[PDB]
Enzyme design. Sequence first.
Site: not given
Length: 316
Positions: A105-106, A67, A216, A71, A268
């Site tokens: 956003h992060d 994050h 995202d 990113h 996953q």
Amino acid sequence: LMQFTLPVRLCKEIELFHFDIGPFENMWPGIFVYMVHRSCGTSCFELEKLCRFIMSVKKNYRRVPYHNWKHAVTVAHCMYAILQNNHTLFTDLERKGLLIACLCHDLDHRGFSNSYLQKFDHPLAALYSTSTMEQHHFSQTVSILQLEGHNIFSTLSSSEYEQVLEIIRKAIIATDLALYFGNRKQLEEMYQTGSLNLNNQSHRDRVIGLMMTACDLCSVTKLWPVTKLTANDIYAEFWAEGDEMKKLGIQPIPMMDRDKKDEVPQGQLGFYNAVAIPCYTTLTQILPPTEPLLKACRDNLSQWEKVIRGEETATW
Ligand SMILES: CC(=O)Nc1cccc(OCCCOc2ncnc3scc(-c4ccc(F)cc4)c23)c1
Ligand SMILES: [Zn+2]
């Protein structure tokens, strides 16, 4: 006028959904400015103010494995590819707002989920009971906008400014994956009964929320060698949070437990089936020019199935 350019391989590859922004950190601001100028124009921001905003945003991202600043810029690039493939659908304000939301956003992520903040009894969990980190990311974004010389929206009316910060607030809140499930379920109903209406502000909001989830999660839409290496960064964060859960005297879920690496391939598969494919499926029904995201997502699921059957292996 001063129009940012890129080497030929970047100038071309940047238009594609599966673009990797590369390992040269000092190029990432130039990549973002370039995308804004082609998405919104050379007019829509004062370049001095923009670059000042970018560099303060970069400074408020932390050194966490996944994050991080890279990113942020990767998620902004996905939103850029979506905006450029659907140039007719979005207002001048939404294009400006959404590339900023993605970059911000992060902000100040420390590599921990909302659940861990609530179990740790972090102060931010007292300030905001839902979407804890996401309301923090937005209040960080507002702070940087209020620093002297950082108001990249300074030329908008009181009215448009408020509209653009409401677009950014909802965009950033929607990156809370807990909100994604209900949001995508409602969009799938409205699409199949034919009630979805892009003129209904309430419908646009949900659609912008799905785009933010799509951007995202966009590491699952890259070519396999990029997807495979990003997985190591994602789990590096997850395992640290699992270790912090054990220090509170709580057994973490298996996907956060570094003692259960063996289960990642199967993990996953769950993630592609329960989260990723449904997300890009619904986004492609609403925004057909986004099909390459779904196609690249299906290709990577097919690579994780190969890993399970031993015809392929990830070292981590
Ligand atoms: C069956 C099932 O529902 N599985 C299921 C459901 C719900 C979340 C779930 O996470 C599986 C972990 C792999 O996570 C990821 N795996 C590959 N790519 C990416 S890109 C972002 C994430 C990411 C995802 C969740 C986060 F909280 C934080 C980052 C991620 C798995
Ligand atoms: Zn993110």
